[PDB]
Amino acid sequence: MGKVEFSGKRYVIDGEPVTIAGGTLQFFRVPADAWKDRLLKMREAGLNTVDTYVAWNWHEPEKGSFDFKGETHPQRNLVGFLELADELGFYVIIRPGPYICGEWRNGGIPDWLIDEHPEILAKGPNGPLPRDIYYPPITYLHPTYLEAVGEWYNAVFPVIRKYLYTNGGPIISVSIDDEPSYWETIFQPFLTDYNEIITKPGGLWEKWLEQNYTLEDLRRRYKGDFKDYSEIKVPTSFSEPLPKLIDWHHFKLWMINEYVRWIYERMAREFDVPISILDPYLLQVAWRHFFTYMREHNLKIHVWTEFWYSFYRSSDFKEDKLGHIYYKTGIYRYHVRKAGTPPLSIETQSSLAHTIDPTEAELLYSILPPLGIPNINYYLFVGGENPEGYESHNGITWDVYSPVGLDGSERPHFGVIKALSETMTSAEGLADAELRPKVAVGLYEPYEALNLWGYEGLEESTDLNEYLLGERGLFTLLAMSNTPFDAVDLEDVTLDELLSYDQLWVYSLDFMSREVQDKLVEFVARGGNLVILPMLPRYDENLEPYSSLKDFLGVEVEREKARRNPRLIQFLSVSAEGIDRMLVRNTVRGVRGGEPIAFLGEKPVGAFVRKGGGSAVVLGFRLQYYTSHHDLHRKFVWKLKELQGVREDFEVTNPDMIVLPMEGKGYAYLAVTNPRGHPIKGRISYRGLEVPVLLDGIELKRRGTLYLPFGVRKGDVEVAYATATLVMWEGDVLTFRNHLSGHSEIALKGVESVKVSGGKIVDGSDGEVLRIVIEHPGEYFEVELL
Amino acid sequence: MGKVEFSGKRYVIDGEPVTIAGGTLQFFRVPADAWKDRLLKMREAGLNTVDTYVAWNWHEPEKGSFDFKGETHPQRNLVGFLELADELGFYVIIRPGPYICGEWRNGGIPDWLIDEHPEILAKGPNGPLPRDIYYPPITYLHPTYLEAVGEWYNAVFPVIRKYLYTNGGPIISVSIDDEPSYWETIFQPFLTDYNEIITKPGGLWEKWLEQNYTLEDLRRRYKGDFKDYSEIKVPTSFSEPLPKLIDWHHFKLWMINEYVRWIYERMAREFDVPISILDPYLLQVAWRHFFTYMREHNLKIHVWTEFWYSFYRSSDFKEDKLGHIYYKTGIYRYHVRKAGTPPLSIETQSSLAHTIDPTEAELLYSILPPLGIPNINYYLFVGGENPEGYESHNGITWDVYSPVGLDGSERPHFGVIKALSETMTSAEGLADAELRPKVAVGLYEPYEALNLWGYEGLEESTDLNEYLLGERGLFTLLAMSNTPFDAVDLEDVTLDELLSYDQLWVYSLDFMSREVQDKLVEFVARGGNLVILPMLPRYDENLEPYSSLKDFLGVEVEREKARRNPRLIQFLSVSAEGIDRMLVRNTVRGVRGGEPIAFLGEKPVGAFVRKGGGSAVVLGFRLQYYTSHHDLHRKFVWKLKELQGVREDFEVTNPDMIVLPMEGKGYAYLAVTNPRGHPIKGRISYRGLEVPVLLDGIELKRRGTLYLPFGVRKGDVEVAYATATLVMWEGDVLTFRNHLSGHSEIALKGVESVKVSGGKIVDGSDGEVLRIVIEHPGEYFEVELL
């Protein structure tokens, strides 16, 4: 019967592509007598999909007693919820754990398991962890754990199976665990896991060492005199060799990988819909290890992501967050496009901030499609409450500003979700259209680890949160400079992939593998344009001296140590052509050789070198997002792009108008956004076409986003452009939305006349085109083709 | 001829009270041909005062080479700027340093001084500080530094004296240095200052010790066996008695005080206008030591404050900030009102955030008058540029989103400043009206120091930023529960002052002085109502066992250590009557004895006692601002208020409508604000009135604030209430502003009928009270009395 398939960027249900617009309704945390009303409110919001966990400890409250029908509590009626969601026309994404996070007791793991079998608990290097901590960590690969999970799955899997879309029910995907990260302990490298199955002679650590390295390799890599693998003790402090620390991290990722494989093999045998997972490891760059392991073991897993930015404070989704969002969507889509599964955000923050400003929510949600993710689930969409004994992180409450309250109230971001869902499910060709940046950023996994840890040994700081990702990060600068970027894994990426970009930015610390340094050399030599900062690498992956990149480039970068104490971090000024005293923070390194292009006083601190038809810019400083009237940071980006020949497909008159062109075959949708949120006006050019023509500019009165059609066609009729979002085109009626100003300009080919409702034509022109300006007193208006 | 006096809350100029509405125009950073136009823009904003620094290193670029007239650079023409400001009818606040901060090179200190005399530099405990750090720190009491400062003052003081308001010029105050804080090093207790003049035998530390304590005292306080003061070496680490660390902190404050007095003695000789200072120490609760010092040396200094919340990122002035602003305004006005000088914010952030949302700016600024500060200077008001060689923190730019840009453009918070300043200068009786809370918080200065350091030696955590001050702090919870509060210094406050409140909240750590413990006992014995959390003190100021408060209360509190590792900090649920599973964080202590009122499972963790004539609520947990549908943290505050009989003078139907009553002699103004910013509707009860009567609730559509008149009158005519701000009443014309909804209700007594302009009457009633509901299409409308 029913079919759930996938192609390109979408799931395909019974042979029709569908864009997922989902809300999370955790049935087990919402009164059963309210489920139907709340699903009707999701219908009203334009959602086609419902996401829910299934919690082990909820449905098996005592060992051996399973309740999926509401026999012991009406909120244990999984069966009834799945039947109701189906009757009401929803797809279901189901997430049966065992771990479900969810701010729920033990993340779904039963106390009766942990209390009876404390030997499964993960341990610290000096003994047990405390027991009153949230989500008690567990040693994944302990057989007693796995056996118990298997018994959970044996109960719940037959219910899932019966209700799969392929069997006449609603369920379209089953997810593995929940963002498995060692129970949110991977961030702290010596908190976990020292369980004896790991650390004993012949234990998992020793076996993993033996599978990955020769003993001699480890003697050289860790600078040790080992006579047997059993002599290489688990690390317990930052005084141990950095290579060994990196290995300990990757060992943990390996154990998570084995756990995920174990679950996958059970799910794959039982279910013929897509098997999914959310944010493996709670890392991003380290996904390289996940996708490689999937390929190695033929695991057909659909990896999904999430976007969370504010917890237990008001929302804070403004221009500051763009760097991080661009980075995360970038590295996500790099891997998922190569796996061939649809990009999807299974958790898109809609709760857990105390007050969610609708314009900030709009910015977050609406930037996901141009950044490659058109399939979006809002979490938590339906507010709830925690049954007694199942509280964890919020006490009784599970309604922290959800779009629909526990009482059925509608909060302001409900209407944001509704408007964007209508567009995403209805606008022809939008989901399939793709941003195609001219620029890439090169990410390097080991640095993610170091940032996670706050590692301090090196010449350069590991505060990549500050210099790359955050409110002043380089990535935020690139976004706000109107420089869209792909993100690539520097170890995995091919030369041909790199050379597909006009400019590659690489942030370097002291060390960089031989394989990556040599690759960058080849990139440049073959015509690539590099920007590298704030130093060149001096060491390889083993911390042994190695500098092929630097030697090829023919410059020299002074040695200087970056500072960590905020009071001691310098405030310095760098000048360049057309750039008088641009602020830079922290230690600045002289760059000798090549053509000097930036200066700290009379000292060169950035240089340009050409090699064949390629080039490199080497900066001895951290370039960050700062803005002002003078706006030198943005200007410097633009000067580097001009130096290396980078030309975007679009131009703007107002630098605060951020444009992301979503290109399809013969058409595009330009996402046009105002992240700063102050009123802005300007013109845009796309591939040489300047818009608007009759209006003085596109006006965006506040923070928000438009998806402007360029070349969207049906038959012989084309929307050459519009300054309003084309929400849908049904028969001969075009529905447009412009919630950011009171007028819109539309340019049409192939039609002689129109009738407008919800507004008045106040201006127009041509033979070439039917151009009209419509004043509309609301957000929505319709143009009927005659 | 002119006189500058002061009474109450206001400076009194030529016999008349004036409300200060200022902007900073740092003439030295603004092109001289724009000064006039910028000052005229300030007059359009309703500003009556201009603030500026005078920079030593700018007007003395070489030793002995002074320029105050533009003889060497047009922006050195201080004299010309003062004449201009005077011609244009501005008051001037002048701030001649020597330190001026200002994101300016060395904070104003000449390089030729530091380069010739490095012996004046502050030292670290291990060696010199680095030379390339911002604001090179200086040993204030080094005779070579003070000689140099004296020469600066011998040059600029005659200029300032000529231009004093008392001598026919515009200058109404001269400020001392700038927030002297040991050059932003006081926060790190072991970064500074180990200059030999401090640390040597017979040096400033040893002399301070001997002035403050006997040797016998120090043996007790430090648990030591010293036979000489020379054995008591300066601390360089936390492996010192905690009292000794507190004394090292206080000794630095004393050095700052000495520096201030040295400056003050020179100024007082020269100047007969108020001598002012901004935020001594960059601390708040430590102001006790500054006011005590003022008293002890008979210094007449006017202490002013500042409000800054976002740096080098977008503004973020939402509900999360209210706890800190209530705290800081509270402790400021506690001290300043005892001093008898006017409350004034000399720097009210209007720049240095990348984009300032006007609603967030309005919340920041408009909350100051109801929190006791009607005199406000907006910094930086006029955007500028730094002369070459004088950059520090921003490179070339000094225009980071100022209200007036470098090019004279207006940014969106200009209009917010204009509208507030027009109201503060025109609304009769507004500036003199006073908040009179029912509740106070008791602040304890040693705990401020421990929060600065992140001190780890105690049972309780010193993370007061988290538990008291910040986004989830207790003080934000108080503010958002509609509980205005005063903030009192526990050490200084009299019993009489305490007993004037209906409830006192005290956050306690392990130790609390015998004086303060005993004062708390007396307070409850004499009828006071105490709330104390999350423990009772077990030690006195010398860390010897001392538990007078506990002993009097007759409770016992479990001993448990609070956690610092975020992964290990507990999430727990506390219940009470009406309160099912309210979230708490971190360790929870049983409280045995008294009437149990709060429970962790079956364990009492909060008790209520009645002792002497008063009462005390003792909580073994940290109460924080979390919100949700259930809203249990606000509800718990409400329950405790009820328990102890605390009744505000107002009631409100919407708990997000925050109300601060400003009480006058025969009238009041109710500040009504929407800090969360989502649209809110509600009704207010106040002064026996219901507001509104006809209109369907007061609507605040977005973040912002109204000052609603109650009882404002001229002769027989009285505004009983209105739901718009009364900005001015001139002749028979009342001018109202409601920029937060499109309808307002007015209630007048003594007048039979009115004429409206700017709106239409859409409902009304009479008889002893004329009530009209006006629909207005703009923010302002007028009511003329007939």
Ligand SMILES: N[C@@H]1[C@@H](O)[C@H](O)[C@@H](CO)O[C@H]1O
């Ligand atoms: N998958 C988790 C959710 O289960 C949790 O509810 C959400 C908010 O903390 O964080 C995401 O990482």
Ligand SMILES: N[C@@H]1[C@@H](O)[C@H](O)[C@@H](CO)O[C@H]1O
């Ligand atoms: N008095 C300083 C100012 O001089 C500075 O310009 C402002 C912004 O950082 O902070 C205050 O603390």
